[PDB]
Amino acid sequence: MVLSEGEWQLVLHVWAKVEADVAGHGQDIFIRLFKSHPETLEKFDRFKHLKTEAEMKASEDLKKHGVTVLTALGAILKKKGHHEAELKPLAQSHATKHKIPIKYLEFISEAIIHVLHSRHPGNFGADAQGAMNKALELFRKDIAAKYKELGYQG
Numbered sequence: 736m737v738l739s740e741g742e743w744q745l746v747l748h749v750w751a752k753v754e755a756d757v758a759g760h761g762q763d764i765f766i767r768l769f770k771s772h773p774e775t776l777e778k779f780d781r782f783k784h785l786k787t788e789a790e791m792k793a794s795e796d797l798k799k800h801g802v803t804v805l806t807a808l809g810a811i812l813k814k815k816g817h818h819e820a821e822l823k824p825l826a827q828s829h830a831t832k833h834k835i836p837i838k839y840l841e842f843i844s845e846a847i848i849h850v851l852h853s854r855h856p857g858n859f860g861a862d863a864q865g866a867m868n869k870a871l872e873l874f875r876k877d878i879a880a881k882y883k884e885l886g887y888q889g
């Protein structure tokens with residue numbers, strides 16, 4: 736699949752807003768993910784002890800992790816589809832070291848859309864959400880293909 740320049744513009748326009756507060760968006764997204772799909776929390780040995788949203792918000796390590804994740808995702812989105820090089824190491828660590836099923840990538844994609852919808856309604860209307868979903872589907876599709884080449888079905 737391929738996004739048009741118009742769709743990329745919608746994606747990058749709302750992403751520019753997210754970059755005004757990467758740490759904050761990172762926390763909201765992971766808290767949403769962990770609360771909505773608690774099973775994903777078990778994949779993080781560093782955070783699986785967190786019991787409440789309050790503890791999650793107060794975790795300095797979780798906040799730093801969120802920044803690392805969103806920074807990596809932002810770099811991929813800014814490539815506008817030409818992300819082969821960026822995807823290689825990400826696909827290897829998540830398939831081989833962390834063992835993250837494609838299903839879980841769908842869950843975090845849902846969390847990202849939910850947070851952008853809540854925080855940026857004016858810049859995240861129907862068309863913008865469709866563009867973001869398409870960009871994330873492309874990401875998940877290419878990651879899945881790499882998973883297979885690497886020997887991980889998940």
Ligand code: HEM
Binds near residue numbers: 779828843
């Ligand atoms: C938007 C998709 C995602 C991106 C861009 C992303 C990115 C990253 C990055 C850059 C790191 C640090 C470097 C590395 O280990 O490769 C990381 C670590 C990790 N990711 Fe992801 N990730 C994504 C989704 C997920 C999901 C859905 C899970 C599982 C629910 C997951 C689990 C992990 C784990 C367990 C680590 C190691 C954390 C640690 O122990 O420090 N990731 N991820």
